[PDB]
Design a protein around this ligand. Structure first.
Ligand SMILES: C=C(C)[C@H]1CN[C@H](C(=O)O)[C@H]1CC(=O)O
Ligand SMILES: C=C(C)[C@H]1CN[C@H](C(=O)O)[C@H]1CC(=O)O
Ligand SMILES: C=C(C)[C@H]1CN[C@H](C(=O)O)[C@H]1CC(=O)O
Ligand SMILES: C=C(C)[C@H]1CN[C@H](C(=O)O)[C@H]1CC(=O)O
Ligand SMILES: [Cl-]
Ligand SMILES: [Cl-]
Ligand SMILES: [Cl-]
Ligand SMILES: [Cl-]
Ligand SMILES: [Cl-]
Ligand SMILES: [Cl-]
Lengths: 254, 249, 249, 254
């Protein structure tokens, strides 16, 4: 049968292909996650139908404990796989079955060049430089759920004033960094992609934590273990590394 | 029921506790993996019995394709869990159910300081400096199975002369690096621990791959997903980081 | 049964948690004493409900000898435990059962930096600099009841002019020290916290006595000895020290 | 009735009085603890009979979980109070009812003057300078029971070679410090007493922990709370402070 794959537009993981003609079906998309999906398909022998998540969200839990985004798509069995930069977290792993990571990463800081700023600590000990994260993303959830002091502190600032320091998406975060005195808490993988296209931007400091992106499947899915096995193979063969090189190269920045 | 936990002595993950008197049961052991196991048992509410793997192996296949080591213990249901620096790999994941990694790592190079060697490619291009890995470990298997040109070249070197360039265990590899002109392909986390204790040694280059250590369970185990979830929580709370800091310094 | 825990807002022991949205129940509060209470509940296995003391007092007697504050709450069995910077004193210990101290302290002097004042004796000998304490706190009562010459002199000064030199609470005492020529007799642990946040202020001299904060229970409570034992264990494990470090820095 | 008070000889808490005639009864003894006992007696209105603990020990638990020393005296109801420098610890509080502390203290280091040594950390990071504690005392038990790294380390050294770095009592520890390259882990109160009599000795660093001496009573004793109340009063009246000054003065050392 044919698997329904939920995904979301996010450079360079999943993007609209460029063409002069209207596009249809899976041919609408290209990017790292599409190449990964093709490799998984070839290895496991399934057909797939790529569908953008209707609410345009990744997956977060509200006050009632109700889920949204690609996570909710899986929970309701409206999709068989989620293939996207979907961060493997404690709260999400409790509600879906993630494959093992196809890409590792950590929270870090995107900022303009030329400044004394060197760490998260630097930001937490002042109020002049604004800083935030994408609202309801795993990065925000990390700061909110944290019981570590410095990150407890950054959260209190981030969420203050009705969350005015937060952004709705990465592109908005990037523009805010480029225009104003603002630093975006962003996943290192996305920082690496952006800083190789726009030589005005840089990563500040190292990785604040350690996690990965995983293919999402519903709890009890027969495909999860098979996908994990295929990802392990692709990693061992150097394939995932090439795929990352391919999509992350960009224009080149020093 | 008290869970049977297979493991293996390996610094600083699992070590004999130093005492003036004889030790018994779980009290014989200390280290990163013991601290992990204690945290896991508290979170999930299980009792456990730590048991050294009888053949003292991690887990590989012979030419007949029979497994050994901690991996065989799980396949055969002689253990409920394996808690050790057991590398999550394609071959192993097909026969047991790993939790998600509690520690990430990659293959890198342990060598002495002060050399001009800067990468695996530097080693592959030459024959003066000897290099190898622990026989039947995931690192050796990585080289054996690679179709990458540089790594194929390295594998031909390592398997030459009836695998004289290989060592039986990490301690042997370390002494070999210290004494002779030899570089050990070794997991990055272990190199970190070694170079903090041997100030004449260093890591050469970066990581040539990306993988993890996971808790091993038999295929179908009801503990695997619970342990994954517990591990994700310990990571997010910064406890795993703290545990590594304690044992690595 | 869920235990009723009486307490009082006082930095940094018990504070309202900062949030963008309204808070409810125990989630309203954070601080040293909340961390202590959580550790205690985990060790002893009790659930608890934190309740601010309705009259907002620690616990003293009026001239009729009736008690108020958290102390009265315990005497009257309106609370199971009091967890707060509640000083273990002779008068209080006679009417409630304190656990052993979770924190030690002594009365000392909070004053501005750059003065030549070096001791309580320096204050007692003069009348230019005003000094006082929080009305009805254990510090005031210490001075009221002392037969030590220097402390008697200080008490006559403090009770002069209808106790104009006294303040209703610590925050008031702190602002008074910052603004005017005034020294506050204050518990050393609180001075430590204040001087880390007000870099123009300092402790003057050493501790003039030795006492502790303890968890309060009604006389006869079956929780008192268990809580003492839990506290001794947290102290020995270095956890209380860590808890203080977290909140005081 | 008359209370049986178990105690042990330890300067300057409990000592044989000096006299030219043989001494009997309570008149054999003097020191801080005797003055404290007298004050407690006057306040509560009891008579007392002071008895040295027969096995000459404070109180520690063996392999079977059997107790000895003054602690065991109380457990077996052979004594009503223990009045001595008996350290209030977790393991002991589980088996007797301690009063609240009459004196506070912490573990610290007794050593010869003139050295670079400044902390416990200094000692733990070498093997040349020997260091230990009184065998089976609460200080030893602290290092043994510890899960803190530096003290975990010191314990392993201390207990090595069949505990050759340990001593049987404080006097032996003091002589060992004065004669050899040895540092004694000792309670600060006793360090203060010794360093004011022997100007060749000094405390190294500060307090490693925080505890007190308490009057011991058996679990369920009717006297414990009354004694706590009396101690609180004595402390508030400045009496305990004077008593300490009186017995700790010694010869004077810079
Ligand atoms: C909003 C984006 C782009 C996603 C991607 N991974 C995280 C997630 O899966 O929640 C989010 C990023 C972040 O929270 O920094
Ligand atoms: C022989 C050791 C120490 C083990 C540990 N992890 C790898 C494994 O789980 O196979 C081996 C190391 C290596 O192959 O570099
Ligand atoms: C009014 C406060 C803050 C309390 C705290 N402890 C003492 C008590 O428990 O009475 C008071 C302070 C003092 O009297 O210096
Ligand atoms: C061996 C002595 C003198 C006693 C005194 N207090 C401790 C106790 O009550 O165990 C011991 C000292 C120590 O362990 O440093
Ligand atoms: Cl530009
Ligand atoms: Cl998994
Ligand atoms: Cl081969
Ligand atoms: Cl008590
Ligand atoms: Cl009066
Ligand atoms: Cl001399």
């Amino acid at each position: 049968r044919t698997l329904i794959v939920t995904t979301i537009l996010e450079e360079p993981y999943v993007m609209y292909r460029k063409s002069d003609k209207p596009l249809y079906g899976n041919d609408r998309f290209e990017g790292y996650c599409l190449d990964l999906l093709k490799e998984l398909s070839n290895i496991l022998g399934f057909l797939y139908d790529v569908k953008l998540v209707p609410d345009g969200k990744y997956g977060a839990q509200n006050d009632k404990g109700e889920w949204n985004g690609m996570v909710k798509e899986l929970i309701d069995h409206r999709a068989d796989l989620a293939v996207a930069p979907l961060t493997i977290t404690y709260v999400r792993e409790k509600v879906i079955d993630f494959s093992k990571p196809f890409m590792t990463l950590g929270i870090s800081i995107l900022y303009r060049k030329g400044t004394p700023i060197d760490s998260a600590d630097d930001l937490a000990k002042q109020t002049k430089i604004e800083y935030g994260a994408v609202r309801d993303g795993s990065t925000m959830t990390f700061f909110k759920k944290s019981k570590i002091s410095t990150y407890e502190k950054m959260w209190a600032f981030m969420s203050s004033r009705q969350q005015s320091a937060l952004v709705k998406n990465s592109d908005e975060g990037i523009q805010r960094v480029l225009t104003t005195d603002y630093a975006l808490l962003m996943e290192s993988t996305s920082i690496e992609y952006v800083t190789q296209r726009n030589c005005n931007l840089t990563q500040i400091g190292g990785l604040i934590d350690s996690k990965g992106y995983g293919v999402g499947t519903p709890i009890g899915s027969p495909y999860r273990d098979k996908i994990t096995i295929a990802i392990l193979q692709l990693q061992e063969e150097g394939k995932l590394h090439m795929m990352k090189e391919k999509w992350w190269r960009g224009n080149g920045c020093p």
